[PDB]
């Protein structure tokens, strides 16, 4: 595909605010393509990375990292307090068809919005 | 908060097939909870394992989707291959619910974008 401005919509707990993220090129070394959203500071912005690997099995890795912006007394430079790391990896085989991969992707997309997942992630309490 | 029968909606390239999954109990050794589909064969069943750690909380989700083909001359089918998926979430002690929900829904929304669907379906980068 060709990198374009991905406009995420109605995301969040309330599902009102939106973000738009644009690409940042591809890292020549290991091929991990990167995208980010403008936030007037290069280090305080939220970033996503995606990378598919060339073989025997195909491995796809997607990382998401966003900081928390805080500005306290004692200095005029906003400081990084805490990050939010996340990563999703797929390890499909070589003879897998498109139907299975689409099934897995859609299953992940639907399951993450299920009440069990939102209860386990938002309130950080395990299932019982 | 407790685990029970959760039914995923339409699923697939055109969202045709659907899967229903039921609890398989909680493993007391490491606290991982298992969810499985009723496929009439224990060997081949779409499996989802979810766990939440304790201290810098860590959320682990693993998906295993096996597919099998009947052997040549053997009546019982043997597993052919399987697709794996791993999702890890990391948060600090001071993370708020708004941030966690925002990250969750952002990850949910990214899988519907053209970039992710093209990358996963066709295994082609940019």
């Amino acid at each position: 595909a060709k990198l374009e401005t991905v406009t995420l919509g109605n995301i969040g707990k309330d599902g009102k605010q939106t973000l738009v993220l644009n690409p940042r090129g591809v890292n020549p070394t290991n091929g991990v393509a990167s995208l980010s959203q403008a936030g007037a500071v290069p280090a305080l912005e939220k970033r996503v990375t995606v990378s598919v690997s060339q073989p025997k099995n195909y491995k796809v890795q997607v990382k998401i990292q966003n900081p928390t912006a805080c500005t306290a007394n004692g200095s005029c430079d906003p400081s990084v307090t805490r990050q939010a790391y996340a990563d999703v990896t797929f390890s499909f085989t070589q003879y897998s068809t498109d139907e299975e991969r689409a099934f897995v992707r859609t299953e992940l997309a639907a399951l993450l919005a299920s009440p069990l997942l939102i209860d386990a992630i938002d309130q950080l309490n395990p299932a019982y | 908060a407790k685990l029970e029968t959760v039914t995923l909606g339409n699923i697939g390239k055109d969202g045709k097939q659907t899967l229903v999954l039921n609890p398989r109990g909680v493993n007391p050794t490491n606290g991982v909870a298992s969810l499985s589909q009723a496929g009439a064969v224990p060997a081949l069943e779409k499996r989802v394992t979810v766990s939440v750690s304790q201290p810098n909380y860590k959320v682990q989700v693993k998906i295993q989707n096996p597919t099998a083909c009947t052997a040549n001359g053997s009546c019982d089918p043997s597993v052919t291959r399987q697709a794996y998926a791993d999702v890890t979430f990391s948060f600090t002690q001071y993370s708020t619910d708004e941030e966690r929900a925002f990250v969750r829904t952002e990850l949910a929304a990214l899988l519907a974008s053209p970039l992710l669907i093209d990358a996963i379906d066709q295994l082609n980068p940019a």
């Epitope: 406009t7 995420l8 919509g9 109605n10 995301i11 599902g15 939106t18 859609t106 997309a109 639907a110 919005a113 | 039914t7 909606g9 339409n10 055109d14 969202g15 045709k16 659907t18 229903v20 829904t105 949910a108 929304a109 519907a112 974008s113 053209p114 669907i117 093209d118």
Partner: antibody, heavy 115, light 98 residues
Framework: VQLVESGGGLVKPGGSLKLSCAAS????????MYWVRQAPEKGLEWVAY????????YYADTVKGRFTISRDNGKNTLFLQMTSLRSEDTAIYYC????????????????WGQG | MTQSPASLSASVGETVTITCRAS??????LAWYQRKQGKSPQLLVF???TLADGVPSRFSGSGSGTQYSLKIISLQPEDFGTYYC?????????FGGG
């Protein structure tokens, strides 16, 4: 608010023809806009879905190649191209939207429009 | 590719009257849709038994797999219209009945 207009279709067993659903008093942006067919008696069925740049190919039967769908977001207007047409296709359609992002499970609300 | 018959009738008085039905494979992903012929249709109930905003309160709804019911106790006058029902589980969908 959520004022919805409709395009003009006045051609039967013939022509290509197009229909336009335009949103107003409402951000087009990300909401998944639906479609539907009425038909005069009895039969009335669901048709294709558009939620974002992708997810385009959710077509019902007899629609797989007969119809094509696209979304313009710079003007908050829908589009629909009709390749073939038979006695099946009537001239009364409606367009509706969705709560939020896709793969959640709520559908078909607020309609309004004509054909 | 499923089916969804309603098979109900009409009435004239409005104090308390009959509820609707539907039958297909299990799991409750449906809605009800008060269609007025002059105007466009509109939503009634979300997720089987949860009514949404801008609706009179006493339009009861309940059901489970293979069984659906919308109860209209404490009915208000001049609001008969015509109702339909759909399911959103598979791709093709039905969105039909009476």
């Amino acid at each position: 608010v959520q004022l919805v207009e409709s395009g003009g279709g006045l051609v039967k067993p013939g022509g290509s023809l197009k229909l336009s659903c335009a949103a107003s008093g409402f951000t087009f942006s990300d909401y998944g806009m639906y479609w539907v067919r009425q038909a005069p008696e009895k039969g009335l069925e669901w048709v294709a879905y558009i939620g974002s740049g992708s997810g385009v190919i959710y077509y019902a039967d007899t629609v797989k190649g007969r119809f094509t769908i696209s979304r313009d977001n710079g003007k908050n207007t829908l589009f629909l191209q009709m390749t073939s047409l038979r006695s099946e296709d009537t001239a009364i359609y409606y367009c509706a939207r969705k709560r939020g992002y896709e793969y959640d499970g709520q559908y078909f609300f607020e309609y309004w429009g004509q054909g | 590719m499923t089916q969804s018959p309603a098979s109900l009738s009409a009435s004239v008085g409005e104090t308390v009257t009959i509820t609707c039905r539907a039958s297909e494979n299990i799991y409750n992903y449906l809605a009800w849709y008060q269609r007025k012929q002059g105007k466009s249709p509109q939503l009634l109930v979300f997720n089987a038994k949860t009514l949404a905003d801008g609706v009179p309160s006493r339009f009861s709804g309940s059901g489970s797999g293979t069984q659906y019911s919308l109860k209209i106790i404490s009915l208000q006058p001049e609001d008969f219209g015509t109702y339909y029902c759909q399911h959103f589980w598979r791709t093709p969908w039905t969105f039909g009945g009476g």
